[PDB]
Design a protein around this nucleic acid. Structure first.
Lengths: 176, 120, 135, 63, 82, 48
RNA sequence: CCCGGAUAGCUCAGUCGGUAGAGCAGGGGAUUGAAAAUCCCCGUGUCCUUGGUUCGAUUCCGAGUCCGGGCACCA
RNA sequence: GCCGAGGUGGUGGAAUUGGUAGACACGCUACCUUGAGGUGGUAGUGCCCAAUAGGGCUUACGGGUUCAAGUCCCGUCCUCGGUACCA
RNA sequence: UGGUGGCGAUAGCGAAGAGGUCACACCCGUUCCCAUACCGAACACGGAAGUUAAGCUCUUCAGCGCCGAUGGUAGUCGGGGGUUUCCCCCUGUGAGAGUAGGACGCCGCCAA
RNA sequence: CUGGGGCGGUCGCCUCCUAAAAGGUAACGGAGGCGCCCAAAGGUUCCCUCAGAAUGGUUGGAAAUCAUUCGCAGAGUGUAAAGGCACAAGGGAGCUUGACUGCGAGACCUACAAGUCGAGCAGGGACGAAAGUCGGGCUUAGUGAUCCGGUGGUUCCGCAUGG
RNA sequence: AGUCUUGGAGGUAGAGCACUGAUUGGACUAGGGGCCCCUACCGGGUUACCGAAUUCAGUCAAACUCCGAAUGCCAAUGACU
């Protein structure tokens, strides 16, 4: 709730004059936040899938979904079906509030966090977060942490170009 | 760069599935429903000749309401089109759920058509 | 041996040689070419002996531009075998050559070479030849 | 919104040890943080320590 | 003497089910008789013809038969009464 | 696997139906509702 | 149609209602100027599964797989 | 010529069932034992990189099919067992 | 202008613009019916702040796609003939390819 | 069966090519299947794209999973093949068993026996609000005569009559 | 029955290379090693040492078709013999 009033009243008028769009409809938004898990433990351990089946729900209460790989892969010793990882999709109000957890709280718990990767855009206006450790925010509760797998987060915007999604995240507060 | 299609074309893909196996013949007209975001519409169409028979809507100067998009607004026009189908008193029609579900205001139109006396 | 690497079928019917050439009816990637004047089969053996006599006379070839390729195979039986009992194993290769087909080319070397160059290859083919310039 | 699947969502009062009070809506109710971003010195422009410490030696004559 | 060769391995064939056109164009065709047999629906049923379960063509009504098109590259059986 | 299966009636006692089943998929006894001609109506049926 | 084999890792036994038994193997022990072969020790078993009689019952009936020996149907 | 079988670590040989081994024995390899031997006793031991982890490579060769192939399917090449008859 | 049909993309993409008071749309929210394997993304429910950017229509243009001649040719039904793995001549038929060109919409029905 | 028989190979079905722009046509002529399988892989209801590529990215690598465009199609079609199919026949969910009994004017095919196709009618159903569909599976294969005895139901006869 | 008449069904001969395969040549190139340089298989330079894709022209088919004749066949329709 805090970021939306910040985004609507402050961030959206700021970038509008910065690149001279002809409407509020041309002012780009950041719609959905999709989070992949993608654990290949099911070849070895089906019980290790249950870790982050339960655990990712504690991050955002929208429960992730069974993601079955749609091609049997013998080089990974994997048949088709056979669930690999989970999928946290998130769009709407809590997702900017999820971003409120990200910038303000999460990132200083990356124990050697610095100016994060600038050129990790797809040439479209979308961004991926390189995270390898899941102990980022005080829910994680180390004594109940047996699995050490991190997390992959995708930023999806309505940015028609790319280099103003560059300038979008700066006004959001993404450090670089 | 997220690109979603229009709702109308998404309606058109699921309207075209309906059009493949029921059509507006003689004395079984295609009683269609259009669902704009500020109104609602109804046409009675014979697809053999391409001739509309009767049509009314919430965008009509008579018997209007305040909401214009309520399910109760569908109850008003759901008998007036059937009153036009009582005006041209054919009263017998294969119903078209035209590109929409049989859930809400579409159901309210057809039930008001049944209660006014259209034979489904 | 200009061998095709992987063919859909080992063996084909032998075809009938009527009509003109579909394409390859005029030299354009070189300036001195050779149209055939009749129609028969041509093997990889009839291209090896062809391509060798091209560069033994020129002594420094610009390019050769071998147009045709042995697409169609052909079979025969092992010797002294009564008729029937299966089409035989594939043995060699066949380039299917209609009359008026540009066979070879000569890239940028003078006429008195080229008049003698394609001469020395015409006696390695079973087909009458003629000498065609670029137009 | 399926019931019986989503855990709850409660308005969190995120507090940092330096006094940075922050508001989200989460599962847990109270979040007490050692170092937030506003407590983190890289968000404070240049951090005080490693910006002045990252120098190479001055081919040290001093002794 | 003779070197005995065998190894046929290919000497089989099915028997063909008899496809193709059956009732000619413009023919007065009674109800319920077949028009055309096809594996894979090449010619769609149009007016007064249904698609069979074995996707052949069977006339619903009596009268004459035509073959118009479905526009781009697609055919149709049209059957009209008298 | 594949076994030929009789699907008899319940309340009447005539067979009227034979189909097949699969052993790993359906090891137990199966049931359906079909049309017995003696019962002259839709009626529950049972594998023998 | 009858009769033969379902336990310990394995090979096998075995009660008339109250429980785990050999051999080989595994693990170690001592023995021996070394070595097997012997000599001890614990090991490990829902006694095939499901219901019933009964106080519970490998025990023991109510319900069935798969390997061998035959009488004998097979258009 | 035709069929029938089979092509492997240094070597001989099983894995011939569908999921990955390249058993097991004999080499070979360092050590232990003997004054040095042979012998005997542990440890590894398919090739090649990583002193480690791991990866590549492969079961005559060549190609398919497979998520897969020592095996499934087919062509070549080698070597065995059987046949090449009647006038 | 909207809704809804038929006509082989000549209805296509592609780029260049214009338009919106209503209209149509995005757009604003889930208290409710219903919902997404997870969600108001869509589907439902309701609302009307500002929005012509998107789609929606309205225009231009031949860059691809598409349509498509005429002329001749290939092949060829029959007619004979000749050196007979093929080939020539006559009556008749006649493509594809290649172009000239056409075309970046026509015809209905109802509402305003 | 047999380009003399011998041995070797094959024997029926399904698809393609030969086949000569209808159908059919042979060769010990070219290529591969089948003696099933499925309780959902059918029935309807409603839902919605695919294959790779290109990027962006922990472990992740050529190739797991996430987005992200460009993609009428390269895939997926229980399985060979041809013919179709992106309005689903491809892909999900719910509910259910029409994998219904009695039929069927009419045809295609055919020497015969077989084999195909189906409007529609009835009784009872399933699904859906309804219209309407459903007489198994995307079509074409997945198997066979009669005689024979076994098996369950039978207003059928039963050797003087009753059984 | 034959001819003329309009109406089709059908995918060979031909032709095309848009799908399928095969295949020529140039430009271009991811990437790959190699002369190997600087040198933790790590920092990058380099060639005609190859090269997938890429597009430009180029051929080719019994089991390749966006195409597609003559005829031949089932027709209706009248006419004539």
């Amino acid at each position: 709730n805090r970021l939306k009033e910040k985004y609507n009243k402050e961030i959206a008028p700021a970038l509008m004059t910065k690149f001279n769009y002809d409407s509020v409809m041309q002012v780009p938004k950041i719609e959905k936040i999709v989070i992949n898990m993608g654990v290949g433990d099911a070849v070895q351990n089906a019980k290790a899938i249950d870790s982050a089946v339960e655990e990712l729900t504690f991050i955002a209460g929208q429960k992730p979904v069974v993601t079955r790989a749609k091609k049997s892969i013998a080089g990974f010793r994997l048949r088709e079906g056979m669930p690999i990882g989970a999928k946290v999709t998130l769009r709407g109000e809590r997702m900017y509030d999820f971003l409120d957890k990200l910038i303000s709280v999460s990132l200083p718990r990356v124990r050697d966090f610095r100016g994060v990767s600038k050129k990790s855009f797809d040439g479209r206006g979308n961004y991926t977060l390189g995270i390898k450790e899941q102990l980022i925010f005080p829910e994680i509760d180390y004594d109940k942490v047996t699995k050490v797998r991190g997390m992959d987060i995708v930023i999806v915007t309505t940015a028609n170009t790319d280099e103003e999604a560059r300038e979008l995240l700066t006004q959001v507060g993404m450090p670089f | 760069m997220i690109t979603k299609t229009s709702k109308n074309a998404a309606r058109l893909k699921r309207h075209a599935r309906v059009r493949a196996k029921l059509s507006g013949t003689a004395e079984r007209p295609r009683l269609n429903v259009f669902r704009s975001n500020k109104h609602i519409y109804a046409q009675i169409i014979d697809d053999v000749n391409g001739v509309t028979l009767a049509s009314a809507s919430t965008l009509d100067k008579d018997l209007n309401v305040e909401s214009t998009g309520d399910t109760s607004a569908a109850t008003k026009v759901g008998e007036l089109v059937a009153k036009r189908a009582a005006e041209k008193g054919i009263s017998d029609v294969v119903f078209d759920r035209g590109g929409y579900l049989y859930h809400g205001r579409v159901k309210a139109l057809a039930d008001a058509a049944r209660e006014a006396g259209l034979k489904f | 041996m200009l061998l095709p690497k992987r063919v859909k079928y080992r063996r084909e019917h032998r075809g009938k040689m009527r009509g003109r050439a579909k394409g390859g009816t005029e030299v354009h990637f070189g300036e001195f070419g050779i149209q055939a004047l009749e129609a028969s089969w041509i093997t990889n053996r009839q291209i090896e002996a062809a391509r060798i006599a091209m560069t033994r006379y020129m002594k420094r070839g610009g390019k050769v531009w071998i147009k045709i390729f042995p697409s169609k195979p052909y079979t025969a039986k092992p010797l002294e075998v009564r008729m029937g009992s299966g089409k035989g194993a594939p043995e060699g290769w066949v380039a299917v050559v209609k009359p008026g087909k540009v066979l070879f080319e000569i890239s940028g070397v003078s006429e008195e070479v080229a008049r003698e160059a394609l001469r020395l290859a015409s006696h390695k083919l079973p087909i009458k030849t003629k000498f065609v310039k670029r137009e | 919104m399926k019931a019986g699947i989503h855990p709850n969502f409660k308005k969190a009062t995120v507090k940092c040890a330096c006094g940075n009070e922050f508001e989200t809506g989460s599962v847990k109710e109270e979040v007490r943080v050692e170092i937030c971003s506003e407590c983190h010195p890289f968000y404070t422009g240049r951090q005080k320590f490693a910006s002045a410490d990252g120098r190479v030696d001055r081919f040290n004559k001093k002794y | 003497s003779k070197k005995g060769v065998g190894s046929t391995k290919n000497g089989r064939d099915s028997e063909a089910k008899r496809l193709g056109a059956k009732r000619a164009d413009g023919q007065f065709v009674t109800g319920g008789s077949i028009l055309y047999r096809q594996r894979g629906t090449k010619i769609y049923p149009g007016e007064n013809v249904g698609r069979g379960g074995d996707d052949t063509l069977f006339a619903k009504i009596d009268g004459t038969v035509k073959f118009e098109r479905f526009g781009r590259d697609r055919k149709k059986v049209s059957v009209y009464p008298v | 696997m594949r076994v030929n299966i009789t699907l008899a009636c319940t309340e009447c006692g005539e067979r009227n139906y034979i189909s097949k089943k699969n052993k790993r998929n359906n090891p137990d006894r199966v049931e359906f509702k079909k049309y017995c001609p003696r019962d002259k109506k839709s009626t529950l049926h049972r594998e023998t």
